Symmetry: C3
Subunit: 106 residues, 3 copies
Amino acid sequence: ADLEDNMETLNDNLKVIEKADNAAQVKDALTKMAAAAADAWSATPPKLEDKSPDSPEMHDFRHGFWILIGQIHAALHLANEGKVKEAQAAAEQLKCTCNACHQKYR
Amino acid sequence: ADLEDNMETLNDNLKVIEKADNAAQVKDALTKMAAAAADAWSATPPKLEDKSPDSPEMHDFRHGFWILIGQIHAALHLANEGKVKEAQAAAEQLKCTCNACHQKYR
Amino acid sequence: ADLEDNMETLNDNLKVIEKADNAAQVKDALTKMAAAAADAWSATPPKLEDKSPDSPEMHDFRHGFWILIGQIHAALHLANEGKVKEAQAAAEQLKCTCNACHQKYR
Ligand code: HEC
Ligand code: HEC
Ligand code: HEC
Ligand SMILES: [Cl-]
Ligand SMILES: [Cl-]
Ligand SMILES: [Cl-]
Ligand code: NI
Ligand code: NI
Ligand code: NI
Ligand code: NI
Ligand code: NI
């Protein structure tokens, strides 16, 4: 999928996590976020279209998805342990990573 | 172990995963793959032997193992949940990463 | 927290893991290490204070925390399976990563 579609999936499922009651719901949403983030990681964003694929900016963009995916994985571990509110809090804190990448590259 | 020996371990255990019936077998193979990939990550491949250790090519080579290890870890999570066929499908899709690194650096 | 405080947390909890009897104790310590390492990852160490934030040295410093966090996560998986002595051995081997970063940047 393209970058915007993956971002819609990330955005939608963050809201699913916020409204969830139980860990199964949180885990299903995190799994979809993980897939969307993995697919977005291969994108070239509009503001970097000319940069060399070996450029520091493209490498940093990809590192942003590594951070997001790592945090999603941590939230998934919490969900697997049934720590719903802790998983929801980790997902809430993902937003810092979304915003940081957006400030540089969106 | 050297790079070729770790690649043999990766290759052999990918076939173990393909032929497996149950998650214990898949998990044992993925664990061996994770160890081989972690050990290969420190290798300098023949086609990069002269490049500076701080070079973009050596950094990219190592990022290739980060990708592989991340995907192995995801397959391991699926195996831990008893999703044998989903774990086998994730392992099958690892091959895209093996091939991509081979195209650049083997 | 600052870098030194996060390093104290890493150091203290490595000793907790060494003295632990059971996986709950090991897991609690690894969780604190993961949080300290994630927080240290954003630090600029004294010996790199002038370097550009886009510099290879700052990027390599951050990759050192990626390695540490990955190894902590592997030890946590072992602890989750109740493999206390294997988790303790993985944590013992973390020290190679602590030392390698210290040799370059401390
Ligand atoms: C590492 C980079 C990065 C991360 C992390 C990231 N984004 Fe984005 N996001 C972008 C870029 C680049 C765009 C602009 C896409 C475009 O203009 O085509 C974007 C666009 C969007 C959009 C607008 C989509 C549209 O229809 O135009 C939304 C919503 C969004 N992001 C939400 C999120 C959420 C939620 C997260 C995390 C949970 C997130 N983003 C994490 C890079 C990132
Ligand atoms: C990030 C880099 C990278 C990844 C990922 C990677 N390889 Fe390799 N692989 C290499 C390189 C480099 C060589 C060449 C080694 C040499 O010539 O000494 C190689 C060689 C091999 C060989 C030949 C071994 C021999 O005896 O000569 C096999 C088989 C192999 N890889 C299989 C795999 C499989 C299976 C995977 C994933 C499951 C994989 N590789 C992933 C870099 C990689
Ligand atoms: C990727 C880099 C990196 C890793 C990994 C790392 N350290 Fe450090 N560590 C540093 C740096 C840089 C300093 C120096 C901090 C300063 O001088 O302010 C330091 C300082 C320390 C100190 C001295 C703290 C003090 O009070 O002055 C201790 C103890 C320590 N590290 C232990 C550890 C342990 C234990 C680990 C792993 C389990 C570890 N470090 C992993 C970079 C790292
Ligand atoms: Cl795209
Ligand atoms: Cl080698
Ligand atoms: Cl600091
Ligand atoms: Ni896509
Ligand atoms: Ni070796
Ligand atoms: Ni990098
Ligand atoms: Ni801090
Ligand atoms: Ni995990």
